[PDB]
Design an enzyme around this catalytic site. Structure first.
Site, PDB file in Angstrom:
ATOM      1  N   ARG A 183       0.803  -1.214   0.000  1.00  0.00           N
ATOM      2  CA  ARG A 183       0.000   0.000   0.000  1.00  0.00           C
ATOM      3  C   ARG A 183       0.848   1.282   0.000  1.00  0.00           C
ATOM      4  NH1 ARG A 183      -1.569   3.294   4.220  1.00  0.00           N
ATOM      5  NH2 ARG A 183      -0.797   1.742   5.721  1.00  0.00           N
ATOM      6  N   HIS A 217       4.266   1.578  -0.843  1.00  0.00           N
ATOM      7  CA  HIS A 217       5.310   1.730  -1.846  1.00  0.00           C
ATOM      8  C   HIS A 217       5.120   1.177  -3.246  1.00  0.00           C
ATOM      9  CE1 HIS A 217       7.569   3.280   1.526  1.00  0.00           C
ATOM     10  NE2 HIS A 217       7.322   2.170   2.198  1.00  0.00           N
ATOM     11  N   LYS A 235       2.449  11.947   6.145  1.00  0.00           N
ATOM     12  CA  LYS A 235       3.658  11.131   6.198  1.00  0.00           C
ATOM     13  C   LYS A 235       4.695  12.062   5.567  1.00  0.00           C
ATOM     14  CE  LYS A 235       5.258   6.422   5.302  1.00  0.00           C
ATOM     15  NZ  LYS A 235       6.414   6.239   4.382  1.00  0.00           N
ATOM     16  N   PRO A 236       5.792  12.351   6.284  1.00  0.00           N
ATOM     17  CA  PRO A 236       6.817  13.253   5.742  1.00  0.00           C
ATOM     18  C   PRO A 236       7.523  12.825   4.458  1.00  0.00           C
ATOM     19  CG  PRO A 236       7.551  12.296   7.817  1.00  0.00           C
ATOM     20  CD  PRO A 236       6.130  11.858   7.630  1.00  0.00           C
ATOM     21  N   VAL A 237       7.856  11.542   4.355  1.00  0.00           N
ATOM     22  CA  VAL A 237       8.560  11.021   3.184  1.00  0.00           C
ATOM     23  C   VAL A 237       8.045   9.644   2.786  1.00  0.00           C
ATOM     24  CG1 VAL A 237      10.777  10.429   2.193  1.00  0.00           C
ATOM     25  CG2 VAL A 237      10.650  12.202   3.963  1.00  0.00           C
ATOM     26  N   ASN A 238       7.894   9.420   1.485  1.00  0.00           N
ATOM     27  CA  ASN A 238       7.415   8.136   0.993  1.00  0.00           C
ATOM     28  C   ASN A 238       7.778   7.921  -0.473  1.00  0.00           C
ATOM     29  OD1 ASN A 238       5.639   5.734   1.802  1.00  0.00           O
ATOM     30  ND2 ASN A 238       4.691   6.366  -0.132  1.00  0.00           N
ATOM     31  N   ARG A 269       7.931  14.009  -0.816  1.00  0.00           N
ATOM     32  CA  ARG A 269       8.372  14.647   0.418  1.00  0.00           C
ATOM     33  C   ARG A 269       7.566  15.909   0.685  1.00  0.00           C
ATOM     34  NH1 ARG A 269      13.795  13.642   3.050  1.00  0.00           N
ATOM     35  NH2 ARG A 269      14.430  11.616   2.182  1.00  0.00           N
ATOM     36  N   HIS A 286       9.731  -3.361   4.282  1.00  0.00           N
ATOM     37  CA  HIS A 286      10.194  -2.011   4.569  1.00  0.00           C
ATOM     38  C   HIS A 286      11.026  -1.472   3.411  1.00  0.00           C
ATOM     39  CE1 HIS A 286      12.729   1.073   6.640  1.00  0.00           C
ATOM     40  NE2 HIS A 286      13.758   0.381   6.183  1.00  0.00           N
ATOM     41  N   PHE A 287      10.855  -0.189   3.116  1.00  0.00           N
ATOM     42  CA  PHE A 287      11.617   0.459   2.064  1.00  0.00           C
ATOM     43  C   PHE A 287      12.716   1.208   2.799  1.00  0.00           C
ATOM     44  CE2 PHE A 287      11.849   1.677  -2.330  1.00  0.00           C
ATOM     45  CZ  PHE A 287      12.638   2.826  -2.312  1.00  0.00           C
ATOM     46  N   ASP A 288      13.950   0.756   2.614  1.00  0.00           N
ATOM     47  CA  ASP A 288      15.090   1.357   3.289  1.00  0.00           C
ATOM     48  C   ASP A 288      15.646   2.592   2.593  1.00  0.00           C
ATOM     49  OD1 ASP A 288      16.674   0.826   5.718  1.00  0.00           O
ATOM     50  OD2 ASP A 288      18.374   0.700   4.334  1.00  0.00           O
TER      51      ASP A 288
END
Length: 124
Positions: free
Chosen positions: A10, A12, A41-44, A85, A119-121
């Protein structure tokens, strides 16, 4: 509760587009993927490749995670992605995002059975 794998999808995955569609892409996507519900969400980062291609990364280059974990994998090839962002002109409930399209290698953390991204690192 949402599974880690489902949450990664959902947050990424955006296969329906080959690349960020306009400077308003992030404002649209962050809202529709429900990433601005109670807070912006600040960053995605969204990945514009098939789910299968992204899941395949869990079998590619094993690298360390930013947090020191060792269950991260870097895609052998670059992928079309869009980083979203918050702009200084953003303020909940009026979230505003800068859209940055790029083609880079993605790094994700994988876990479970099936062994899939959770998780997206980062991206390189």
């Amino acid at each position: 509760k949402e599974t880690a794998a489902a949450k990664f999808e959902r947050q990424h995955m955006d296969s329906s587009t080959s690349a960020a569609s306009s400077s308003n892409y992030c404002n649209q996507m962050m809202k529709s993927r429900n990433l601005t519900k109670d807070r912006c969400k600040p960053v995605n980062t969204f990945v514009h490749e098939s789910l299968a291609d992204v899941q395949a990364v869990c079998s590619q280059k094993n690298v360390a995670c930013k947090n020191g974990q060792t269950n991260c994998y870097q895609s052998y090839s670059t992928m079309s992605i869009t980083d979203c962002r918050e702009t200084g002109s953003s303020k909940y409930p009026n979230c505003a995002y800068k859209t940055t399209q790029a083609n880079k290698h993605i790094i994700v953390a994988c876990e479970g059975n099936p062994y899939v991204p959770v998780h997206f690192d980062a991206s390189v």
